[PDB]
């Protein structure tokens, strides 16, 4: 399952409300350097013929089809306070080794 | 499955001779901060029962079963020359840029 | 020197109250694999004699003297809203892209 | 000092010979994500009005002026064999914390 934490959902709902117009979020993964992978997290106004759309806690999360299996299991979290305020990704099968 | 290019296979077949010790390569993933992930590439002596072992051009590639969702269809590759000399990963689950 | 924007200062002045414990922020650098570096941003209770302490809008910023070459002229910044919500660093020594 | 290790110099000299034409390397540092910095390492055919040119072990290393202080102290190394073959950067004031 791709999911949002409660805080991530409440934050995201308040940006989508306050921005008025929209479909939802893209979740994505891209290359970063020669040995890294980086989560991609942005607003999208429509799904592409290449996406699958998931929905959790009322937000639509658009995910490219060729990355669906990779991204399965990720949870988007939001840390509301402190020096690491912001969005965060986790996945129980990717260990902090 | 997992594969290796002719150049990566040739380099790793060499490293294997020169250390005459192990079973093959492990290919893994780990966390890299809260917004990404890094490849793990190492020599392993023995597989575990949690692993799925592929063999391509004489190199056994060992992958923990729970990491397959991140890695599957990946080609391990190698650039002989230039400033990016080294191993690199060509991963269909991951988008370029 | 080191500075903070009005938004980052306001957020950090809050975090400071709410924990009523420390002296200010430490800004540092560390290694991030063999091809890069990461910012360190934390609360410190006491400076050391190795540090250079700046103060901007009521927040003491503590920097190890040997890290100044990486950090100097840096502004600590903060984005209240959107998917990049969080602290960010605006560092004149470092090029954008 | 900005320096090249012996191996990095011999490797680099053999690419600049074999490529025939050139001035030297750029060393650079760029942003990477919201909390990362990435070394930039490429060939350049000329210095820009913005660069300072350094020379060590016979190779010209071109460095943007606004990044000179940041980059002071870095050594470019080259690992000739093993799974981490390739170029590498170090700096005694950036600890592997």
Your description of this structure?
Four copies of one chain form a homotetramer. Chain A has 97 residues and is α/β, with parallel strands linked by helices. Helix content of chain A is 19%, strand content 43%. Chain A has a single domain, classed as Hypothetical Protein Aq_1857, Chain: A (Sandwich), CATH 2.60.300. A four-stranded mixed beta sheet of chain A has the order 3-2-5-4. At the A-B interface, strand 2, strand 3 and strand 7 of A face strand 2, strand 3 and strand 7 of B. Strand 3 of chain C pairs antiparallel with strand 3 of chain D. It is classed as metal transport. The entry lists the keywords Fe-S cluster, iron, Isc. It forms a tetrameric assembly.
Content-based structural category of chain A:
alpha/beta
Oligomer: homotetramer
As a percent range, the share of strand residues of chain A is 35-45%
What is the CATH C level class of chain A, in words?
Mainly Beta
Task: Assign the CATH architecture of chain A.
Answer: Sandwich
CA-CA gap between termini of chain A: 23 Å
Radius of gyration of chain A from the CA trace?
Answer: 14 Å
User: What is the β-strand count of chain A?
Assistant: 7
The H/E string of chain A reads EHEEEEHEE
The chain pair with the largest interface is: A-B, 28 and 28 residues
Shape descriptor of chain A reads globular
Number of helices of chain A: 2
Strand count, sense and barrel status of the largest sheet of chain A are: 4 strands, mixed
Q: Write the CATH homologous superfamily of chain A.
A: HesB-like domain
How many distinct folded domains of chain A?
A: 1
Strand order in space, largest sheet of chain A: 3-2-5-4
Family (chains A, B, C, D): Belongs to the HesB/IscA family.
Protein name (chains A, B, C, D): Iron-binding protein IscA
GO biological process, one term (chains A, B, C, D): iron-sulfur cluster assembly
Keywords (chains A, B, C, D): Iron, Metal-binding
């Amino acid at each position: 399952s791709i999911t949002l934490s409660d805080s991530a959902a409440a934050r995201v709902n308040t940006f989508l409300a306050n921005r008025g117009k929209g479909f939802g979020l893209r979740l994505g993964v891209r290359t970063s350097g020669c040995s890294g992978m980086a989560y991609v997290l942005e607003f999208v106004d429509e799904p592409t013929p290449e996406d699958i759309v998931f929905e959790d806690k009322g937000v639509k999360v658009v995910v490219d089809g060729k990355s669906m299996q990779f991204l399965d299991g990720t949870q988007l979290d939001f840390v509301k306070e402190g020096l690491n305020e912001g969005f965060k990704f986790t996945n129980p099968n990717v260990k902090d080794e």
